[PDB]
Ligand binder design. Structure first.
Ligand code: PLP
Ligand code: PLP
Lengths: 277, 277
């Protein structure tokens, strides 16, 4: 296949990472994941804006204009002939001899991007998924979508070992986020979800679902709910670019309500579907 | 130069990292940094035991024995003819297509290790340094020396822009550790330092200093102290393999006592010298 390397589309083999790439040794980089539906990139601009925003938060300067970056992303989809799946891309501060502090502005940021054929998780969208409560041990800057993810892999892995799809993180017993997604809860026709602060990444799918909720005249309250209040909800689902709107029907062997995908979830999934290419 | 790559000492050029190297995308891996004093490695067994310990905490199985590793490290010191500097080595889970949960027991961990000429910070060890208080926003598993270091880089950089050497981290106004070192406080001939828990990395230099205190009949209290109490210490300093015992004589424009290196610090630095090759 083809991989985007800085400003070049090259063959995977030709691509190589240096042992002193700040993202390799420190996790000094940012990233994004864009979904493609039949050759069409879903909400690409939203994703491109956040890359630049996340890079700016750690004072990384991307050498290209959002336009040059958009074009490069499109060329990559064609060269790979990606139909339905996703585009992954990141930016690290660049390569320099090991040191914690920032290097000299001289260092060029390394950019890597590639594709993968991956269909929508239809079975999960229909029948729902299992989940587990895992304690939040991640760092305090989750608003930045960076490569500092060791906290997430340990959470996700615990979920997997129990046969769960996602792990729901909570700090001070208050639900925050999923290892790799945003958590929503529904009680009496009202949508609840933890507000946007340093505790959670302000997801793009998360924002679309709030627009969808506003469109179908459903009220939304960005109020934090506890893990006990979570098990008392009528419906519960998680969101992420790849997961879309995945229903959560059971947490730790405790069926949410009756253990069936709710009607409001369905309406949101039905409304969301209209925005997809 | 020569780079240790898995089980082969090869030239920097023959070594190549893959973009789906879990340590590159998730910071999924651990590391160590040993000091070499005139061809002789300092406390090398202690460091290798913490590498294997740190790997075990995230379920990484190093394919070689502690001997094969020791042997390899020694070859690397000779091939590079390293006199006085340090060795940096690390282990990642390996290369596998992008996914948060662990891959299969098939994937081999990628091992990297290389040297660097770096003298002793004589100036700092004699005249002391300036520091700055920075809030601890790191993940909750610092007991593991992992590659999830974005919190550390962001802290060091802040100290750096303020012309300070190190950043003294505090969580809930209680001093925990530096961006990349352990903190010690002295008040009335008694040695104070934060106890070993998930909040701090149990450093090797830290333990040496604690042994050096017992040997010189100095009382050690592993009681955490606040920032308000830190500013009231007779003496203050930080430790690490590369900073050894660096004395901090000022925190944010505020001198620690008279702004001179304390006598107890001098006695510890003197005793520490006896353990060096
Ligand atoms: C990437 C990510 C998400 C999802 O954001 P989307 O834009 O919906 O893909 C949610 N939470 C965390 C912690 C993430 O890293
Ligand atoms: C590596 C490290 C240290 C120092 O440990 P040493 O064995 O003395 O080098 C101290 N604090 C943190 C946070 C570290 O990561």
């Amino acid at each position: 296949g083809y991989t985007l390397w800085n400003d070049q589309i090259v063959k995977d083999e030709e691509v190589k990472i240096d042992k002193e790439d700040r993202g390799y040794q420190f996790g000094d980089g940012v990233y994004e994941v864009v979904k493609v539906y039949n050759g069409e990139m879903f909400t690409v601009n939203e994703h491109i804006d956040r890359l630049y925003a996340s890079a700016e938060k750690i004072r990384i300067t991307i050498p290209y204009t959002k336009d040059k970056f958009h074009q490069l992303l499109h060329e990559l989809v064609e060269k790979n002939e990606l139909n339905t799946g996703h585009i992954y891309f990141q930016v690290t501060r660049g390569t320099s001899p090991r040191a914690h502090q920032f290097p000299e502005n001289t260092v060029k940021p390394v950019i890597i991007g590639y594709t993968k054929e991956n269909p929508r998780p239809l079975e999960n969208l229909e029948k729902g998924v299992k989940a587990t409560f895992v304690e939040d041990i991640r760092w305090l800057r989750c608003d930045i979508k960076s490569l500092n993810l060791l906290g997430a892999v340990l959470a996700k892995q615990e979920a997997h070992e129990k046969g769960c799809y996602e792990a729901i993180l909570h700090r001070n017993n208050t639900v925050t986020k999923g290892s790799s997604s945003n958590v929503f809860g529904i009680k009496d026709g009202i949508l609840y979800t933890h507000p946007a602060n340093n505790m959670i990444l302000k997801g793009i799918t998360r924002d679309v679902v709030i627009a969808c909720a506003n469109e179908i005249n459903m009220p939304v309250k960005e109020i934090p709910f506890t893990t006990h209040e979570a098990l008392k909800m009528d419906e519960l689902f998680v969101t992420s670019t790849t997961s879309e709107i995945t229903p959560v029907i059971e947490i730790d062997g405790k069926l949410i309500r009756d253990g069936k995908v709710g009607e409001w979830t369905r309406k949101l999934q039905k409304q969301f579907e209209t925005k997809i290419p």
